[PDB]
Write a protein that binds this ligand. Sequence first.
Ligand SMILES: [Fe+3]
Ligand SMILES: [Fe+3]
Ligand SMILES: [Fe+3]
Ligand SMILES: [Fe+3]
Ligand SMILES: [Fe+3]
Ligand SMILES: [Fe+3]
Ligand SMILES: [Fe+3]
Ligand SMILES: [Fe+3]
Ligand SMILES: [Fe+3]
Ligand SMILES: [Fe+3]
Lengths: 171, 172, 171, 171
Amino acid sequence: VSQVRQNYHSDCEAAVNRMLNLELYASYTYSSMYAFFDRDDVALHNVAEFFKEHSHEEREHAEKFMKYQNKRGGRVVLQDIKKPERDEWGNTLEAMQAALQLEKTVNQALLDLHKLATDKVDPHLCDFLESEYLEEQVKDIKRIGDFITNLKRLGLPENGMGEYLFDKHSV
Amino acid sequence: VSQVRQNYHSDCEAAVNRMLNLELYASYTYSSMYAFFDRDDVALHNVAEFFKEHSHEEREHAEKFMKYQNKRGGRVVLQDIKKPERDEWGNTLEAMQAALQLEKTVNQALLDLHKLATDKVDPHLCDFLESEYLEEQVKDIKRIGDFITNLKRLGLPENGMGEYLFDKHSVK
Amino acid sequence: VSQVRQNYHSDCEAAVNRMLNLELYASYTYSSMYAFFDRDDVALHNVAEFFKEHSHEEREHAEKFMKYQNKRGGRVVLQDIKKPERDEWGNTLEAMQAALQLEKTVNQALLDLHKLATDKVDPHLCDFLESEYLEEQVKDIKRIGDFITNLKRLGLPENGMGEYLFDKHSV
Amino acid sequence: VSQVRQNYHSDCEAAVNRMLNLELYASYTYSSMYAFFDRDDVALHNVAEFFKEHSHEEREHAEKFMKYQNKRGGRVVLQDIKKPERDEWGNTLEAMQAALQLEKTVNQALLDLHKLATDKVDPHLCDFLESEYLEEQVKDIKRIGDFITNLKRLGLPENGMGEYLFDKHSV
Ligand SMILES: [Fe+3]
Ligand SMILES: [Fe+3]
Ligand SMILES: [Fe+3]
Ligand SMILES: [Fe+3]
Ligand SMILES: [Fe+3]
Ligand SMILES: [Fe+3]
Ligand SMILES: [Fe+3]
Ligand SMILES: [Fe+3]
Ligand SMILES: [Fe+3]
Ligand SMILES: [Fe+3]
């Protein structure tokens, strides 16, 4: 038992480890979309850089969980980082739609981690989650949603021109 | 009642009053430590300053509670501030050790207030505790722990050369 | 075939996909060391941050591989990133010894991917490896070598003081 | 013999001369394309400026060869620079397609020379090609590809509005 640990459930410790992995998984996925839109036969660089940046942001969320772990006195246990569901992502719309699902998923795991944290009466974990993750999620979901709606408006999947515009004007 | 009072429970006002006293108590104890490391026969000046600093911080944590008490409509009520447990702190290791406990004690008094505040449906007192105290506590507790580990890596309490390096390298 | 592809053998393309996965694995391992020297019962922060950055550096060698793949016309295919081979790292000397082996493992894979290149007669791939990876590797290796030498000099694994000084002066 | 020549095979010297002439030829063509898009019945001025640009880059590449020739103590021998295959380039998609082949033809020419150099053990001519030409080539090839894909996304050659948009955003 760490000299530092106080009011930290084992269940919450394992959960954070589990969450740390979800975040790395999501980052890995955003990285795949980046490399896809960077293919010469896709070539949408603004769409690519938008995923490369989301990938990095996601990596941070993970580093941030590692720190939270040690500060509470739990121990980081790492798992395999599984490869993303697909090797290719079709077009901007499809990618955005997978993104939207990815974020909703990640957000549900955080929502569960908070509910778990409430059960175990750990207000420090709740505030961490609230302050660093919860609101950050709804902003990403809103942002992404706004895009999908614009992509559809712009003629996707069929409208080549609409995809080209979205790349130039929306990111 | 206070014209300003709303959703503030007697039991919570009283706990805030106790919490303030605990802060002051901690303040006085770190104060005691500074004095000790300042003595010619202890002479660890950076460690001493560390405890002087933490002391001021703790005193700030107690004022923040006064401001709050008044802010919610409740009434500050002061109690004696009891002298620290010891007049002498042995060395850096013992002192860091006593401070961990002190910090973990204060932490718990605060988690107990958050509990009390949750049960009394007082989201304001909960967000106050959360954003002003709770995170500063786990940070203090990790910083002190980090220290103990190094203080043990360096050879304490036996090794003096190690305690000397700690004053020069782990603090200011 | 990609309109872009000229003189990229598929052997090299698949070997590039593997180097990629390797860099990520290396990066994952370093992330683990970072989180280790950060636990309250270890607490060598300067050592931790040296692994955190090495982790980032690796991460970027990986991205640099994805970008290459697209530039040549090859297709990026991702695999699982495997959890590091340990969960705790003992101490600064053990960790540094682990890193030496890991780095020499990557160096070798690079060297192979270069012989593979030389043999398929791909001068661009060769010059790429020579310019962005080969010398970075022997530099990073010479660096860790030095560290080990000093760690051993400082009394590791037993000399608590030696280890604590290394944290303050060598990193 | 030049007082300066050392390890410079006559076959390499000759191939440098031909590589020089290829460069000039590539220049002249891009120049033609410039002239085309600057016509009042074509009128894609950014597109034209892109090709004027490339035209300069290539004359630069020819010059670097003249100087390399004299650096090695070989003799620069000039040839006719023959006119481009067309006097008119149809449209942006065709111009880009024509340049994609043009670059690949130049690229292969270089790779062939790099091999001639390997067979004659001229590490210098070899490094020279690696550092000044090779990576530059696959960059230009990737870039023109990206364009061709985007150009198709925009419905070329049929869609005029797309061609307009391409000239206003990609170049
Ligand atoms: Fe996230
Ligand atoms: Fe995200
Ligand atoms: Fe709450
Ligand atoms: Fe306090
Ligand atoms: Fe404190
Ligand atoms: Fe590497
Ligand atoms: Fe490295
Ligand atoms: Fe050229
Ligand atoms: Fe070479
Ligand atoms: Fe060129």
